[PDB]
Amino acid sequence: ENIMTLPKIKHVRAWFIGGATAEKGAGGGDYHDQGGNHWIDDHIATPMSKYRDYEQSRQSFGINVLGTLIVEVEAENRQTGFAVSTAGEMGCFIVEKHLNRFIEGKCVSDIKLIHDQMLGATMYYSGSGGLVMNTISCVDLALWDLFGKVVGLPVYKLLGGAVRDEIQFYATGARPDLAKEMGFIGGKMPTHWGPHDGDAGIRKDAAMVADMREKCGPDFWLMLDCWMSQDVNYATKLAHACAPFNLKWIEECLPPQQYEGYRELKRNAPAGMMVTSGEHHGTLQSFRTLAETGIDIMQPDVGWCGGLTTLVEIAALAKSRGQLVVPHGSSVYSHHAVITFTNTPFSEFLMTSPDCSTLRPQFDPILLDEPVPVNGRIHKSVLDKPGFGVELNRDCHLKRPYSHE
């Protein structure tokens, strides 16, 4: 009846790769930090694509300026845990100059305490989400990684265990037809035109969906991701133009503050067609507001909504409402969470392959031993390693802009 003995945390450190102060196209934790000729930068509709200079490329307006934050927590026994997110150099500042004070000297089991202190202390400048929240998440995930690594358990077991033997995935990218051949259950395509394109824009994105429906058959799901680029009327028209092809859902039509627009969009959705959002929302209380709009599925990003600790709360909010939660695809950081969620029957795999024809690891190259779906699935046994089961690729050129103590 002798309790396992636990170390205190000795050090936290932060590095970054890519972003505006290192090397363009570093990939890793910042999905959009890619090179030339990538589907993910191919005329994707956004709040800026209405501007001729920023229509063809999201990189051009700066989708890639942040790069990847890496947070590593070191216990007094020299065991480490870490995690990666989008924030880069500014995230380093926050961790090294502010948050380190709540982290260092706590018990490795003090995760929810540190998470609470981190939210309480940054509330005056975090704005609910975005950069600061991504940084908090990255710290939360490192803490879980360390705690599992010290205990010798996968995070999914610390959470109360898998509720299914494998995760099934849909794939996000320009090639649902190729994804069907790889064994995925569905494909989510980006929209390429926006409100300023009017009926032509609706015609083109609907024709894209109609084409893939013909290529993929009736049972493979199709979805559109709209990345905050629309307004209520354009989204309504687009959803109705795609209804004949059984589009499963239409995602992130509006900027995240537009809760009232989401409520109106869901009311106007075609019967049976779901409306989703959440990947840019942050904090449990924001997801309360989002859920009450009546959207079918919230899609938090673990690396952005506040971390694993927040994600688990969001899952319970959804469950309380008899609804699914389907987190954005965040490799192992989402895998260990969703395989324990009875109300996450499937998950997302984002194509980082430039032409969506191969299975590049999602956070390539920053994670060593990073799993990829095989036949559209990741077996729970693949996740049976301590923490989130990966190691940091120290061959990437990690920059340390700040230090402390």
Q: What share of the chain is helix, strand, coil (3-state, %, to 5)?
A: 35, 15, 45
Distance CA 88, CA 67 (A): 5
Identify which of residues 32 and 115 has a Cβ nearer to Na ion in the complex: 32
- Judge whether 59 and 32 are in contact, CB under 8 Å: yes
| 74 known member of a binding site | no
Judged by CB under 8 A, the chain residues 346 through 365 that form the site for a copy of itself are none
CA distances, 286 to each of 228, 298, 314, 330 (Å)? 16, 11, 10, 20
**Which of 24, 177, 183, 312 touches a copy of itself (CB under 8 A)?**
312
Residue 211 or 346: the one with the smaller Cβ distance to a copy of itself is 346
- Cα separation, 336 vs 155, whole angstroms: 6
305 near a copy of itself (CB under 8 A): no
Q: Which residues bind Na ion (CB under 5 A)?
A: 225, 279
* Residue 86 binding target from a copy of itself, Na ion, none, CB below 5 to 8 Å by type: a copy of itself
Q: Which does 255 bind (CB under 5 to 8 A by kind): Na ion, a copy of itself, none?
A: a copy of itself
191 interacts with a copy of itself by CB under 8 A: no
Tell me: is residue 251 an annotated ligand-binding position.
yes
For residue 289, the number of C-alpha atoms closer than 13 Å in the C-beta half-sphere is 15
DSSP assignment of 230-247: --HHHHHHHHHHHGGGT-
Q: Which of Na ion, a copy of itself, none does residue 111 bind to, with CB < 5 to 8 Å depending on kind? A: a copy of itself
> Is 348 annotated as contributing to ligand binding?
yes
**Annotated binding residue 292:** no
Q: Per the annotation, does 391 bind a ligand?
A: no
Rounded Cα–Cα distance for residues 27 and 370 (Å): 14
Q: Which of residues 301 and 363 has its CB atom nearest to a copy of itself in the complex? A: 301
CB closer to a copy of itself out of 65 and 359: 65
Residue tagged active-site, from 38, 115, 328, 336: 328
| 194 touches 229 (CB < 8 A) | yes
Question: Which residue matches tokens 């956004």?
Answer: 46
Q: Is 151 in the site for a copy of itself (CB under 8 A)?
A: yes
Partner interacting with residue 272 (select from a copy of itself, Na ion, none; CB below 5-8 Å by kind): a copy of itself
Q: Which of a copy of itself, Na ion, none is residue 35 near (CB under 5 to 8 Å by kind)?
A: none
User: 362: Cβ–Cβ under 8 A, 6 or more apart, which residues?
Assistant: 31, 329, 330, 331, 349, 350, 352, 370, 372
Query: If binding is defined by CB under 8 A, does position 395 make contact with a copy of itself?
Result: no
Q: Which of 30, 58, 33 is nearest to 44 (CA)?
A: 58
Is 6 among the residues that bind a copy of itself (CB under 8 A)? yes
What's 38's DSSP letter? -
DSSP-derived 3-state class of residue 188: strand
328 is catalytic: yes
User: Do residues 333 and 161 touch, judged by C-beta distance below 8 A?
Assistant: no
Shortest distance, CB of residue 112 to a copy of itself, whole angstroms? 4
Establish whether 279 is an annotated binding residue.
yes
Closest distance between a copy of itself and the C-beta of residue 131, in Å?
5
Asked whether position 246 contacts a copy of itself by CB under 8 A, the answer is yes
Residues 258-277 that bind a copy of itself (CB under 8 A): 258-261, 264, 268, 270-272, 274
Contact yes or no for 142/72 (Cβ under 8 A): yes
User: Among residues 14, 63, 73, 326, which is the contact residue for a copy of itself, using CB under 8 A?
Assistant: 63
Q: How far is the CB of 358 from a copy of itself (least distance, A)?
A: 26
Active site residues: 328
Sequence ranges of the binding site for substrate: 32, 58, 348
